[PDB]
Amino acid sequence: WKYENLGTTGTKLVPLMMPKAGDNRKLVDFQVLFNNLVSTMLGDEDFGIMS
Amino acid sequence: NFTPTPGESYNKNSPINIAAQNVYTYVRHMNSGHANYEQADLMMYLLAMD
Amino acid sequence: TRNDVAWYARYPHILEEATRLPFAYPIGQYYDTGYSVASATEWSKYVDTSLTIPGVMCVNFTPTPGESYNKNSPINIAAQNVYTYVRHMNSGHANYEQADLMMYLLAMDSLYIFHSYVRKILAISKLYTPVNKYFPRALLVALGVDPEDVFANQAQWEYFVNMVAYRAGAFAAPASMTYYERHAWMSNGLYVDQDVTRAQIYMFKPTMLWKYENLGTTGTKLVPLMMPKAGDNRKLVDFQVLFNNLVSTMLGDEDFGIMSGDVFKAFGADGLVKLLAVDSTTMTLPTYDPLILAQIHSARAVGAPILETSTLTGFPGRQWQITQNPDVNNGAIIFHPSFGYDGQDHEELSFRAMCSNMILNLPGEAHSAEMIIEATRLATMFQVKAVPAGDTSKPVLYLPNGFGTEVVNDYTMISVDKATPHDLTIHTFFNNILVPNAKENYVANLELLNNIIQFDWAPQLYLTYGIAQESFGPFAQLNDWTILTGETLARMHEVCVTSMFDVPQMG
Amino acid sequence: TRNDVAWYARYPHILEEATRLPFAYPIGQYYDTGYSVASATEWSKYVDTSLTIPGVMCVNFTPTPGESYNKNSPINIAAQNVYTYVRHMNSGHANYEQADLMMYLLAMDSLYIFHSYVRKILAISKLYTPVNKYFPRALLVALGVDPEDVFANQAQWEYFVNMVAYRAGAFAAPASMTYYERHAWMSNGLYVDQDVTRAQIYMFKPTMLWKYENLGTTGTKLVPLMMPKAGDNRKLVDFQVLFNNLVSTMLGDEDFGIMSGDVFKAFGADGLVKLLAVDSTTMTLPTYDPLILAQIHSARAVGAPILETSTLTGFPGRQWQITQNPDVNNGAIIFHPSFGYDGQDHEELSFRAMCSNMILNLPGEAHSAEMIIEATRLATMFQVKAVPAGDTSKPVLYLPNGFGTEVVNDYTMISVDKATPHDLTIHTFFNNILVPNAKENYVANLELLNNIIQFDWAPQLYLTYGIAQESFGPFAQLNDWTILTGETLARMHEVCVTSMFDVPQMGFNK
Amino acid sequence: RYPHILEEATRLPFAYPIGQYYDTGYSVASATEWSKYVDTSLTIPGVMCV
Amino acid sequence: RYPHILEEATRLPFAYPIGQYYDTGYSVASATEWSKYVDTSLTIPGVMCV
């Protein structure tokens, strides 16, 4: 579940698909996935206040 | 191959909404929390951490 | 001569494994039973798979001083009694009369009911049960508050209720005058219909309160101030302007301070009505009280309060008013409301079913005098019809044969919707329910009836139909009933109005 | 919480004089409430002054051996066990099979039920009470008997009951088989709903009994013999004709004589069912039994029995029958009855409301296994529709998913009328009630509902409105409940039918 | 904290007798339009003779 | 004598986390016409490197 902020009209959790069992993904793909996951969380001050 | 879920939720009487109310009461009121977010925001932060 | 072992004791594991079923379903929750045939989905509404169980029935009441037509009324005799008690305990020349003191003493009751109401709104919000999902939001919706405003603004709500208790606690009122203790007992308390964990809850909410409205040399006139109804999502600003409208004429006023100080000198500080304080740990638990349940079971709803803005075609000047005027009835406190109103300037044809003699029903077979007279408190019977003026009148009004220290206006029931998203449903009704001729409201009326019979001591229903031109009588289960005529209920009402307003011994 | 009012203690004389009220109105007669508003006679039917409290709800049942469509049924397992004990463990005769012995044991139960029936008719007629004017005539009307006949011919009734108990002793049947004890305990008791003075009364009456039929070498039947219904006003001669018709094919059959002597030899005279004698001093007082009330609550009426003269378009061969044939179906006893019949050749569309899963609610919060297994004895859930033989079919029939030792056909409630004679009213109804679109059906249905809610552990109602094409679900006050599906109730039915037909007097499982 | 809730939700009848046909029933119940595509039967054998 | 009213009137959110911008808001709601003459900003610094 990837966090999505819509502002005053709500807040989503959207799917972020993981690699499947034939994909042969390197470390750079998992680093891109982790950067895409925490992208909308470390710069949000709503998340900082709640944290 | 699994998908993490908060449970099925279509009204306020859901387990995730009851848990949202409980954790928002403990964080916001029993401890002096901030007032710029609601219970659904705190629960979705707790769901995004998982 | 040897009795052999039975089958259930020869195979106890078979019996205990076949009968292991999950009981104690949480209420506050929609349940689908499913189909046992499963081909019956072709029979769409002819198969009912829904199971909704209600949780809250709120009794919506109006506090009254009893019926009053002259100075021989029990409220005026009580005014005389309490005024000669207070005046003969206070050295000096008073500036107020007996009627001013009794009108102060009723306005203080409306303040104390307001404080118990907002403290109930506060103390409900901390209730949680896993097996009751109506807690606390259905209780808050039934009291007419926005439930999210109480959780979001909890400290401001606590400040408001503590300031109401501080500002209304500055006035004195006698503690040994059971009117205050009874109204506090009703307004502070959640009542289960049965002493179980998944029980249905009864509440008491004021429909209106009495606002003082000083007039000067032309007397004193307690006016209605309507409370928020269930479904109104009222916030703290609305309850604040309601409190400010209730105290605008008596907060920093000299006459109310003089009357309060005279009551404070007459009755000691131990003899005054104490308002409960509320912290963040204050909780009211649902209790089992058979006296509450006995008077709910024999409650009869009188209808909506008539206001000065309420339009009634053939009835002008019938608004509910506790009045006082030295020009009228020799300065007596006057209150005689007419009943059978619901808004909606037309005749509510279902109030004709309230013209029978009531049935007072109790459980067991031995009934004490205290139980019998406590079970008749919310009961009000009509006596005659009010006379219109103009030979063209749309509603039909009724005069009672006396009433207690409070009358019931309405009942509001909170259940769960059987349609998605299964939110709370709000149904307001009298004892008398009209079922007009349309296909929508037959199954809806049956759902209301099945919802009402879940409540163990629910008020007795009277149902009229449109095409039938016919009312059906008391829809309730009876155990040990008697038939009350209006004169027996009038005598019990006069006894209980006298007992509520009674002052101790000295002069 | 509400300190007591000190004014009531200081003036108890005024409180006692103001609250002298006539409670304990005797039930059995009409009461008028009167008028609070004396001018409300102009609003004639919009004011209800009537108060009709009912007294009797008769549960009309059919005794069953359980559902049986193969040899693995509980009745066939019981047939094998009792035939092994009678034929082989004791030296029995070899001219009959296990299905013959089991059908003899099933035909004896109808005799025992008939004896309990006429014994309850006799014991009711001596009951008169100042507090309950339903006694005894409403109980006698609900059982189908002319109540003046039992009064005028009390000695003849009293000796006929004893003669039934005497002539039933020509046939031997085991006493540890709790099928007989259950049916005798059901069809004789007067059951009170709340354990107070003028409480409501539940009875159990057989709708039909199983009459024995011998086809010779091509099988053996049990066919229905209909009992009188609650308006019939039957004299003693009708009940004597019914008892003569019941034992007509049993006392002259030497297969039954051989099987009777074999059961007598195998179990001994001390281990047989003893229908006990009644004297002139024999009374039944009504009892409080929360197991019986838990049976009546959550009971499910399956409809009328289907007879061979019954007219069912699209269903020509669906008459209720306990049949065995050595050529058919491994020689197993077959009872596969269709349900949902209303006595007419059309679709009773309120039985469509019996197609959802049932609710079983019990008192309290701690239910024992014995209590849960007892409370499901009259519950019957439909499973599938029957297949119509053809394409045109007016009724809709239902196959169950098993049933207990008895199915409910009907309920009959006796109440007083609200119109000016104020006589006894007889209403018969299922759990499912159709309210058709007519101007006079809604107030009558509401009176039926309000009479039903006087009975404490009443059956749960399912009301269908013809104007809305919509049914409403279980009209009852709930408690600690579950949702039962068909397989759980089928497992409980399997358990109880196995436990009823078990004879511990046998040499089995020691 | 709620052992009664757990013990009441999990009381199921185990130990079904073998030698017996079992119908599982439908969980969707509209699926009777899908006649043999839904399998509700449960047969368990008892004897394998060598 | 009235510590409940004192506790309810002084439930204040202290311990604002430093590192982010805070807006104070407007005591006078019409003071947006005086745009830069009203300062609603609060920027607390964290690091001074010598």
Side-chain angles (χ1 to χ4, degrees), chain B residues 10-18 21-22 24-25 28-30 35 38-39, chain C residues 27-29 125 127-128 133 135-137 148 151-155 421-423:
Chain B
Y10 38 80
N11 49 57
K12 267 272 188 170
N13 208 1
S14 301
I16 197 57
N17 278 298
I18 290 167
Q21 160 185 330
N22 297 146
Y24 185 75
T25 303
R28 166 70 204 275
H29 295 119
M30 301 182 63
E38 292 309 313
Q39 51 156 76
Chain C
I27 65 170
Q29 183 69 42
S125 63
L127 287 154
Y128 172 73
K133 280 184 83 90
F135 295 159
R137 286 192 80 258
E148 318 314 306
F151 297 129
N153 305 119
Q154 176 163 344
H422 314 301
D423 287 358

Side-chain angles (χ1 to χ4, degrees), chain D residues 27-188:
Chain D
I27 60 149
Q29 56 182 3
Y30 176 83
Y31 295 110
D32 205 74
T33 70
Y35 279 98
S36 290
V37 180
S39 63
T41 47
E42 69 183 358
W43 290 327
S44 60
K45 277 192 283 186
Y46 286 96
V47 195
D48 196 354
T49 69
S50 286
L51 210 58
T52 67
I53 289 95
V56 190
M57 200 194 285
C58 197
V59 185
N60 308 328
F61 73 96
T62 277
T64 65
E67 200 187 33
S68 181
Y69 38 80
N70 49 57
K71 267 272 188 170
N72 208 1
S73 301
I75 197 57
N76 278 298
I77 290 167
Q80 160 185 330
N81 297 146
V82 75
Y83 185 75
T84 303
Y85 180 73
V86 168
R87 166 70 204 275
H88 295 119
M89 301 182 63
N90 308 87
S91 297
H93 289 62
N95 50 275
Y96 56 92
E97 292 309 313
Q98 51 156 76
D100 295 311
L101 186 62
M102 205 52 241
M103 281 211 189
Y104 159 84
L105 291 187
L106 285 179
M108 276 317 287
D109 181 59
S110 287
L111 259 60
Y112 298 154
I113 288 171
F114 189 86
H115 168 72
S116 293
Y117 182 33
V118 292
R119 179 180 145 216
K120 197 181 61 184
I121 291 157
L122 172 71
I124 274 162
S125 57
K126 317 152 75 184
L127 267 171
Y128 288 80
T129 315
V131 313
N132 203 334
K133 298 184 71 201
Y134 281 120
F135 293 160
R137 282 197 84 254
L139 296 175
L140 289 170
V141 166
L143 292 177
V145 194
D146 177 64
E148 280 79 59
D149 176 84
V150 198
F151 186 81
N153 307 127
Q154 175 79 2
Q156 287 102 319
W157 270 97
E158 200 270 332
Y159 273 77
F160 166 69
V161 171
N162 279 133
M163 286 320 283
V164 162
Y166 278 138
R167 283 308 97 230
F171 319 101
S176 289
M177 181 155 132
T178 52
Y179 189 66
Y180 301 140
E181 184 207 55
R182 159 154 188 92
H183 280 308
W185 166 67
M186 259 174 57
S187 62
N188 205 56

Side-chain angles (χ1 to χ4, degrees), chain C residues 58-64 109-110 113-114 117 120 142-144 183 186-187 203-211 223-230 232 234 239 242 246 300-307 310 320 339 341-343 378 405-412 428-430:
Chain C
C58 192
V59 187
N60 310 329
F61 71 97
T62 279
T64 55
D109 175 64
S110 296
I113 294 175
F114 189 86
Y117 177 37
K120 195 192 199 178
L143 292 179
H183 278 327
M186 286 165 55
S187 310
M203 282 197 307
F204 288 101
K205 189 197 68 78
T207 295
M208 46 72 68
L209 291 171
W210 294 112
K211 184 190 153 68
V223 85
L225 177 67
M226 284 274 181
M227 293 289 104
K229 300 180 172 309
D232 308 346
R234 302 288 203 251
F239 287 87
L242 276 169
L246 205 62
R300 317 179 100 244
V302 309
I306 309 177
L307 311 175
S310 290
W320 292 13
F339 294 150
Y341 189 50
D342 53 333
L378 309 180
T405 50
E406 66 274 341
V407 294
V408 174
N409 299 97
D410 261 321
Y411 319 93
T412 289
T428 313
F429 52 93
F430 310 118

Side-chain angles (χ1 to χ4, degrees), chain B:
Chain B
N1 308 328
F2 73 96
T3 277
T5 65
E8 200 187 33
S9 181
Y10 38 80
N11 49 57
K12 267 272 188 170
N13 208 1
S14 301
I16 197 57
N17 278 298
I18 290 167
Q21 160 185 330
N22 297 146
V23 75
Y24 185 75
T25 303
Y26 180 73
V27 168
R28 166 70 204 275
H29 295 119
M30 301 182 63
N31 308 87
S32 297
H34 289 62
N36 50 275
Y37 56 92
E38 292 309 313
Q39 51 156 76
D41 295 311
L42 186 62
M43 205 52 241
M44 281 211 189
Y45 159 84
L46 291 187
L47 285 179
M49 276 317 287
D50 181 59

Side-chain angles (χ1 to χ4, degrees), chain D residues 449-494:
Chain D
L449 286 160
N450 193 57
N451 284 134
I452 281 172
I453 67 180
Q454 308 310 127
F455 289 81
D456 206 5
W457 295 104
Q460 308 170 17
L461 306 168
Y462 289 86
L463 283 88
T464 300
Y465 283 94
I467 188 181
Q469 306 97 60
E470 182 174 357
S471 299
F472 183 76
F475 194 90
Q477 174 198 49
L478 296 187
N479 275 268
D480 211 353
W481 53 269
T482 56
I483 306 177
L484 253 52
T485 57
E487 294 296 328
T488 303
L489 190 67
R491 181 155 160 211
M492 286 186 281
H493 284 152
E494 177 85 25

Side-chain angles (χ1 to χ4, degrees), chain C residues 439-491:
Chain C
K439 68 184 290 183
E440 291 64 29
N441 40 50
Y442 285 112
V443 196
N445 172 248
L446 203 57
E447 171 154 70
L448 175 82
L449 255 53
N450 189 234
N451 270 338
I452 277 165
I453 70 176
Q454 304 310 309
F455 290 83
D456 206 17
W457 304 52
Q460 311 167 16
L461 308 173
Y462 292 86
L463 282 80
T464 178
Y465 284 91
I467 46 168
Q469 285 94 32
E470 187 171 7
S471 300
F472 183 71
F475 201 89
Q477 181 201 221
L478 316 175
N479 318 100
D480 203 17
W481 57 272
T482 191
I483 295 173
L484 257 67
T485 52
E487 295 72 29
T488 315
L489 192 53
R491 274 193 303 274

Side-chain angles (χ1 to χ4, degrees), chain D residues 187-205:
Chain D
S187 62
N188 205 56
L190 292 181
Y191 299 107
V192 87
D193 79 320
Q194 205 179 6
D195 202 21
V196 294
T197 291
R198 45 205 69 82
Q200 269 65 30
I201 300 292
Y202 289 116
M203 292 189 291
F204 289 104
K205 186 186 78 62

